[PDB]
Ligand binder design. Structure first.
Ligand SMILES: CCCCCCCCCCCCCCCCCC(=O)OC[C@H](COP(=O)([O-])OCC(O)COP(=O)([O-])OC[C@@H](COC(=O)CCCCCCCCCCCCCCCCC)OC(=O)CCCCCCCCCCCCCCCCC)OC(=O)CCCCCCCCCCCCCCCCC
Ligand SMILES: CCCCCCCCCCCCCCCCCC(=O)OC[C@H](COP(=O)([O-])OCC(O)COP(=O)([O-])OC[C@@H](COC(=O)CCCCCCCCCCCCCCCCC)OC(=O)CCCCCCCCCCCCCCCCC)OC(=O)CCCCCCCCCCCCCCCCC
Ligand SMILES: CCCCCCCCCCCCCCCCCC(=O)OC[C@H](COP(=O)([O-])OCC(O)COP(=O)([O-])OC[C@@H](COC(=O)CCCCCCCCCCCCCCCCC)OC(=O)CCCCCCCCCCCCCCCCC)OC(=O)CCCCCCCCCCCCCCCCC
Ligand SMILES: CCCCCCCCCCCCCCCCCC(=O)OC[C@H](COP(=O)([O-])OCC[N+](C)(C)C)OC(=O)CCCCCCCCCCCCCCCCC
Ligand SMILES: CCCCCCCCCCCCCCCCCC(=O)OC[C@H](COP(=O)(O)OCCN)OC(=O)CCCCCCCCCCCCCCCCC
Ligand SMILES: CCCCCCCCCCCCCCCCCC(=O)OC[C@H](COP(=O)(O)OCCN)OC(=O)CCCCCCCCCCCCCCCCC
Ligand SMILES: CCCCCCCCCCCCCCCCCC(=O)OC[C@H](COP(=O)(O)OCCN)OC(=O)CCCCCCCCCCCCCCCCC
Lengths: 347, 96, 83, 171, 99, 174, 115, 98
């Protein structure tokens, strides 16, 4: 693509997301989702292989279906209230339609099937954008309409997301599919506390985006998309694999790392609401994510896999480009737990 | 030439609109009496139709507010002939 | 000087359609902002009485509202009659 | 709930102004000139009260003023008025511009026989004022009392007592 | 909005189409203008939680105005009870209701 | 003549059942344009003259037209027919009977509760009683796009330009 | 409704002309008579001949231009506003964006019927 | 609610079911998407005209133009898939299972 055209398409994706987050009118929110999808489709097809084309097609189908359901929910809400302002929904079935549409856009468990395939089918930069920036708009809408969501529907979808992200990621040797299933589990963690405290959702989203940015930038730095290709990285740049190991430990929520903060805060906020069984289930289920994170860490940094003879060529060469803000992303994703009370700034 | 003519066509429209404005109090006064008469005739009829419906109470406003509410077509023509209510609904739309 | 004149020469010699279209579009962009008549068009649109001019109750101290349509008070369309 | 109170049928009876749209349009300018008092008074009532039932007698006076206006037209040159509104009636848009000759001799009647000058362009569209005797409606919307507002915030900000108090943190 | 840029910058980006009692072209009124106005003036500045119970009457009247459900029920009852007495030869609709 | 919007809406739903049972896409498009025509008629009966003519000119003569044009290029060697599958017949028949059952229930009961509460007391009944004056309220509301809807015009025009750029990015095929 | 009667009459008379046109002639048909016409020989079916991205691209660009035209149609009533400077700014804005779409398609190959 | 609204919402439900229940062709699913948009347009138009929400008269125009932009995008995606496989069959879009 033309660098100017790619910059414009990226800016249009972000501007659709911003239109979603700054509008008080449902039509403009729908417009923002539309603009985001329109600009997003070409960045998925940037490399243009049949895998990229299929990933873009599946993404388009799911997002367009969700957008039509969202518009139908808006129209039912208007039919019963005459209201365009994004606020509590005045109709229950419109609320159900909207919740399902937003979950399908996010990729929650009953609508999760697109996330692994699309993430695998696109490049690591496209996947980084897909699993970080594309979560903002639906989650912001959900935080705005949280006072009218059905807690049972939302909590069901979140628990299923955690379970499926844990189980699906257990079987993966592809790094992009592992990232997608980790993303499903983390979206479940975000959406479980959404009925109770949207500040916890924002906190968890920020921590997850930091970890995902760090991990995807480490993968791009490594040029690895399979677990065996990553197993060669120690023999080229062991610093990258050790940083990746501490980041994976953070993703598993191991104290004293930054990834433990969202789980701990969400468990506390849930127990404040007489919710004890669900947090226990969620914390226990996250051990699956931690298991395949630990498998990746074993294959990458904690042990040394066989290398190749052609790796001696790569030793005499440096990186042409350097990932921006990667050291900051790594420090933020691992070391920020002592700063937890600053979460009140998100209030 | 089009400037001259379109400028003249704007004053003619102002004159027509002012003729309508002068006529409007008559039409408003007439429409009020017509609507009120239709509503009251419906009321007098439903006092007869609904005598035997047990818990029915005739004239009972559907709204909490006692403020005047402009009636729909159903309240006005719901007891009249199909031709009349068809006219009152679609006569303007269908007039070509 | 000669560079822009030569470019206009080449465009007029090979793409007269684009020259005419860009000149027409540029004038359509520019001319309204210089016209004394644009304000007149705004005034004509404002003087068109679509709605009923529902009156006011003179609580006293309303010396500029007419009373009657033919009283020397309220806006006048004498300007529009000669334009 | 509650009974919609309605006027009776004889509360709604009036001498109708039974002339057609072309007759009404032909006299409309002189009608606005000569019948402004009760017309504007009734329109004031209708917008002030937002109730057809509150302004019936004002509309009844509107009707009477129109009736007497037309009876004044009838006795001096019913004939030029008849020609003018016939010519207005012919055209399918009831245009004034096709009948200026007939409007001319209708207008130079009412001047000489009745004194009626025809309003100029824009005069009939003016917002005027009416000196009514009817009291100003107090609650035209029949509004309920509005809910009491949540108490405002008073006082000066003091630092959080013992800080965040989040678990083990001391600040 | 999640980020109320409009209220910080004083811009009206989409609030003008947000209700039917907002300013309209040529001052054409919404069908439920008074009902929406009364509900909005009741519910203003007391929060949605309070407004859901303490402005229930205004919102009910508004919803009835929008979708005349109870009005339609009452009209349907009058219609079908009229027929319930045409068959038996009980009720004769009067001349002004037949022509 | 008494009921016109109801026949139009029933035909609308019938066409929806027809093209959503998914025969070969040319017959699906034919059903879609029949549905669009009857829906344009529906909104014409409600006073939406400009909106219905927009349906016609841009949906049926634009978007559809383009759809049928593109189907005429990417199709099957023997472009399929409705009859070729028993699945199409089954889906269309089930949709038609679920239309008939629910319209009969609503007509003879007027208090169905399929997801939403419904009352087939008529369709003229909900119309309000008033004068719109010397203008079409719909046209005045839509012409407000340039005075009231500045933000809407900005975002829609940007999205259309982006759409051109996007289509040219995707279809290049490299 | 007059318009409905007019449409009914037009459609009915067109279909009647079909019926006379397609049933009145005397027929005698054999296999080689109704064979597809190919200038004296038989046509090849081949496999999905109507191809090439250019036919689809002109359709898509017409679709997007038609959408902007849909945005331009309310213009005759838009000139009747008191706020004429805003309306003129927005109408000219929409037309510049139409011109920009045309120019971008033009410069980036686009409208060309290439080799 | 009046029965026209019932039939319009029913049309939306039928289009949604037709889109969710796939068949071989991609164009059939895209036509179901278009039907969903058309039913949304008519529902919005009926609601807006009935309540005389005058400024909301422009909302169906915006919905139509944006949904047609999405339809153009989907058509381009279908054309790319067909150029890959000679058909628009969704069963060829399965190589991301591995
Ligand atoms: C960003 C800078 C991208 C760039 O270099 O664009 C050059 C740009 C496009 O060049 P190109 O060759 O067409 O495209 C190259 C590719 O981008 C591939 O080039 P690359 O391999 O260097 O890309 C690395 C990759 C990985 O990203 C990076 O290396 C940098 C971006 C991520 C970190 C910084 C952003 C997040 C900061 C806040 C984090 C939370 C606190 O960059 C991207 O994926 C960029 C995507 C578009 C920008 C927006 C990304 C947002 C991500 C975060 C979302 C959530 C934020 C919080 C809410 O060219 C210009 O002239 C501009
Ligand atoms: C509150 C606001 C706090 C920040 C105030 C402004 C600070 C300076 C702004 C400029 C800046 O740091 O740009 C970093 C910006 C970040 O990109 P990068 O890829 O991280 O650059 C690292 C290279 O080593 C860059 O190496 P280099 O050799 O290319 O350039 C050395 C670089 C020095 O670059 C740095 O020191 C890297 C940036 C360090 C700080 C980055 C984050 C700052 C904000 C705090 C984030 C953590 C918050 C933790 C708490 C969160 C809540 C608990 O300084 C400059 O390029 C000139 C700076 C003045 C213009 O880099 C550049 O502007 C140069 C490229
Ligand atoms: C340039 C300095 C300029 C200067 O004169 O500054 C005077 C300045 C005067 O402040 P002050 O309030 O008058 O005196 C201190 C108070 O008496 C005593 O503190 P406070 O009463 O003001 O309270 C501070 C407050 C708020 O404090 C905080 O939020 C930050 C906590 C540390 C602050 C102090 C050190 C910061 C700078 C050094 C960072 C080194 C990191 C090494 C990481 C190693 C990881 C294995 O602490 C709390 O609310 C709870 C404290 C216990 C929980 C800490 C975080 C738990 C979550 C993370 C678990 C992971 C393990 C623990 C953390 C990582 C280190 C092992 O003092 C300092 O800069 C030093 C303060 C030392 C506090 C230590 C608290 C125990 C925990 C950390 C000990 C282990 C790390 C080694 C730290 C010491 C060697 C680097
Ligand atoms: C790039 C986009 C540029 C758009 C044109 C610039 C603004 C045009 C204009 O006069 O807008 C007035 C309009 C309206 O202001 P107005 O002063 O014309 O008032 C209009 C009053 N009514 C609605 C009753 C007719 O500006 C806006 O609505 C601001 C919207 C955000 C613009 C952001 C541009 C970037
Ligand atoms: C307690 C929690 C944290 C626990 C983890 C702490 C750090 C662990 C680091 C990796 C440990 C496992 C691997 C051990 C084997 C040896 C290291 C290795 O894998 O590679 C060694 C290699 C050395 O590279 P070198 O040869 O020096 O390069 C010279 C230039 N060519 O490369 C390296 O040595 C790279 C080392 C990278 C270190 C990354 C550190 C990231 C941030 C750590 C935060 C720690 C937080 C502690 C608790 C805080 C609580 C608030
Ligand atoms: C107090 C209570 C104390 C309870 C103690 C007992 C339970 C906890 C301790 C479990 C210890 C064992 C962990 C798994 C070890 C392992 O390696 O198991 C064997 C097997 C190996 O799998 P793998 O390496 O992928 O095989 C590659 C083949 N080519 O592994 C597998 O095949 C995959 C196993 C994945 C899951 C491993 C365990 C995860 C953590 C346990 C909780 C699981 C989820 C619970 C929550 C509810 C979920 C519905
Ligand atoms: C609230 C009320 C309901 C609202 C929703 C509308 C319900 C009625 C309208 C139905 C619309 C069309 C439904 C069927 C759509 C369709 O095309 O289904 C295709 C599907 C599989 O097709 P295919 O894989 O091609 O089959 C093998 C071919 N050799 O076909 C099959 O799998 C076989 C069955 C075909 C017919 C199924 C009809 C089901 C309708 C109700 C369930 C869905 C809702």
């Amino acid at each position: 693509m033309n660098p100017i055209i790619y910059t414009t398409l990226i800016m249009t994706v972000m501007s659709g997301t911003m239109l979603v987050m700054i509008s008080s009118h449902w039509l403009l929110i729908w417009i923002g989702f539309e603009m985001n999808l329109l600009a997003m489709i070409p960045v998925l097809m940037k490399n243009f292989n049949p895998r990229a084309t299929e990933a873009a097609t599946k993404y388009f189908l799911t997002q367009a279906t969700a957008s039509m359901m969202l518009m139908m929910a808006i129209i039912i809400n208007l039919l019963y209230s005459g209201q365009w302002t994004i606020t509590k929904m005045f109709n229950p079935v419109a609320m159900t339609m909207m919740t399902m549409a937003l979950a399908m856009k996010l990729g929650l468990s009953p609508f999760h099937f697109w996330v692994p395939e699309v993430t695998q089918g696109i490049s690591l930069q496209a996947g980084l954008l897909l699993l970080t920036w594309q979560k903002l708009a639906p989650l912001s809408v959900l935080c705005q309409i949280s006072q009218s969501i059905n807690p049972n529907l939302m909590l069901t979808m979140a628990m299923l997301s955690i379970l499926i992200g844990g189980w699906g990621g257990l079987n993966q040797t592809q790094l992009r599919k592992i990232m997608a299933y980790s993303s499903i589990a983390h979206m479940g963690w975000m959406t479980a506390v959404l009925p109770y405290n949207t500040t916890m959702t924002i906190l968890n989203l920020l921590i997850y985006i930091t970890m995902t940015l760090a991990m995807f930038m480490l993968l791009i730095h490594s040029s690895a998309t399979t677990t065996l290709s990553l197993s060669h990285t120690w023999n080229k740049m062991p610093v990258i694999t050790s940083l990746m190991m501490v980041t994976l430990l953070s993703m598993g929520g191991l104290p004293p790392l930054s990834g433990f903060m969202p789980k701990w805060m969400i468990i506390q906020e849930m127990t404040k609401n007489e919710s004890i069984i669900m947090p226990t289930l969620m914390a226990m289920t996250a051990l699956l994510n931690l298991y395949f994170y630990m498998r990746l860490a074993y294959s990458s940094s904690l042990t040394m896999f066989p290398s190749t003879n052609n790796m001696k060529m790569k030793w005499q060469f440096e990186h042409t480009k350097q990932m921006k803000l990667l050291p900051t992303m790594i420090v933020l994703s691992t070391l920020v737990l002592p700063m937890t009370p600053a979460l009140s700034s998100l209030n | 030439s089009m400037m001259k003519w379109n400028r003249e066509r704007r004053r003619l429209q102002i004159e027509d609109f002012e003729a309508r404005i002068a006529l409007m109090p008559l039409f408003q006064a007439e429409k009020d009496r017509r609507v009120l008469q239709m509503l009251r005739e419906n009321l007098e009829e439903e006092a007869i139709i609904m005598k035997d419906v047990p818990d029915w109470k005739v004239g009972e406003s559907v709204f909490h507010t006692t403020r005047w509410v402009t009636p729909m077509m159903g309240e006005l023509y719901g007891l009249r002939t199909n031709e009349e209510i068809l006219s009152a609904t679609y006569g303007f739309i269908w007039y070509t | 000087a000669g560079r822009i004149a030569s470019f206009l020469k080449n465009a007029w010699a090979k793409e007269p359609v684009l020259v005419a279209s860009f000149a027409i579009g540029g004038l359509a962009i520019i001319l309204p902002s210089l016209s004394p008549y644009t304000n007149y068009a705004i005034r004509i649109n404002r003087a068109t009485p679509y709605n009923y001019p529902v009156p006011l109750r003179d609580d006293g101290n309303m010396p500029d509202v007419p009373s009657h349509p033919q009283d020397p008070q309220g806006p006048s369309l004498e300007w529009l009659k000669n334009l | 709930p509650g009974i919609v109170e309605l006027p009776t049928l004889e509360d709604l009876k009036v001498q109708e102004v039974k002339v057609s749209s072309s007759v009404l349009k032909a006299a409309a300018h002189h009608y606005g000139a000569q019948c402004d008092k009760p017309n504007k008074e009734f329109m004031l009532c209708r917008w002030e009260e937002k109730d057809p039932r509150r302004c019936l007698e004002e509309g009844k006076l509107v009707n009477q003023c129109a009736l007497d206006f037309f009876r004044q037209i009838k006795r001096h040159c019913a004939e030029p008025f008849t020609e003018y509104w016939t010519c207005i009636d012919y055209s399918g848009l009831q245009l004034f511009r096709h009948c200026r000759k007939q409007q001319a001799k209708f207008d130079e009647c009412v001047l000489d026989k009745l004194g009626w000058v025809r309003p100029d362009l824009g005069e009939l569209s003016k917002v005027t004022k009416v000196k009514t005797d009817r009291p100003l409606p107090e609650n035209p919307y029949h509004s309920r009392a509005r809910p009491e507002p949540n108490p405002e915030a008073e006082g000066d900000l003091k630092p959080a007592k013992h800080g965040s108090r989040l678990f083990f943190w001391t600040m | 909005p999640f980020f109320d840029v409009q209220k910080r910058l004083g811009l009206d980006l989409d609030r003008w189409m947000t209700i039917q009692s907002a300013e309209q072209p040529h001052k054409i009124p919404g069908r439920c203008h008074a009902f929406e106005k009364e509900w909005i003036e009741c519910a203003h500045g007391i929060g949605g939680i309070r407004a859901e119970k303490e402005c229930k009457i205004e919102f009910d009247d508004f919803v009835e105005c929008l979708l005349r459900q109870k009005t339609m029920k009452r009209l349907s009852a009058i219609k079908r009870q009229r027929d319930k007495l045409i068959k038996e030869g009980k009720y004769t609709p009067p001349p002004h209701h037949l022509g | 003549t008494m009921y016109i919007a109801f026949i139009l809406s029933t035909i609308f739903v019938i066409g929806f059942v027809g093209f959503s049972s998914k025969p070969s896409p040319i017959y699906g498009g034919l059903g879609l344009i029949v549905s669009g025509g009857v829906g344009c008629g529906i909104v014409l009966n409600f006073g939406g003259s400009f909106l219905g003519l927009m349906v016609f000119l841009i949906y049926l003569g634009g978007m559809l037209v383009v759809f049928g044009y593109t189907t005429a290029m990417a199709t099957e060697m023997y472009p399929e027919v409705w009859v070729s599958n028993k699945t199409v017949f089954g889906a269309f028949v089930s949709g038609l009977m679920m239309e008939f059952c629910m319209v009969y229930y609503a007509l003879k009961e007027e208090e169905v509760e399929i997801i939403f509460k419904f009352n087939g007391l008529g369709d003229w009944v909900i119309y309000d009683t008033g004068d719109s004056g010397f203008f079409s309220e719909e046209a005045m509301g839509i012409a407000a796009l340039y005075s009231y809807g500045t933000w809407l015009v900005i975002v829609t025009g940007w999205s259309l330009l982006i759409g051109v750029v996007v289509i040219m990015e995707i279809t290049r095929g490299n | 409704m007059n318009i409905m009667l007019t449409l009914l009459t037009n459609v009915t008379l067109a279909s009647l002309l079909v019926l006379i046109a397609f049933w009145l002639p005397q027929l005698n048909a054999y296999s080689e008579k109704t064979s597809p016409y190919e200038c004296g020989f038989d046509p090849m079916g081949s496999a999905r001949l109507p191809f090439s991205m250019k036919f689809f691209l002109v359709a898509i660009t017409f679709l997007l231009f038609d959408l902007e035209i849909a945005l331009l149609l309310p213009l005759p009533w838009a000139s009747q506003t008191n706020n004429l400077k805003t309306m003129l700014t927005m109408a000219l804005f929409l037309l510049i964006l139409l011109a920009a779409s045309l120019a971008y398609e033009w410069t980036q190959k686009g409208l060309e019927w290439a080799e | 609610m009046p029965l026209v609204y019932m039939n319009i919402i029913m049309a939306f439900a039928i289009a949604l079911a037709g889109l969710l229940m796939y068949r071989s062709h991609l164009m059939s699913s895209l036509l179901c998407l278009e039907g969903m948009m058309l039913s949304l347009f008519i529902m919005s138009t009926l609601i807006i005209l009935n309540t005389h929400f005058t400024l909301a008269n422009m909302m169906p125009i915006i919905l139509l133009v944006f949904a047609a932009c999405e339809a153009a995008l989907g058509l381009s995606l279908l054309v790319m898939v067909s150029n890959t496989y000679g058909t628009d069959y969704v069963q060829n879009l399965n190589l991301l299972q591995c």
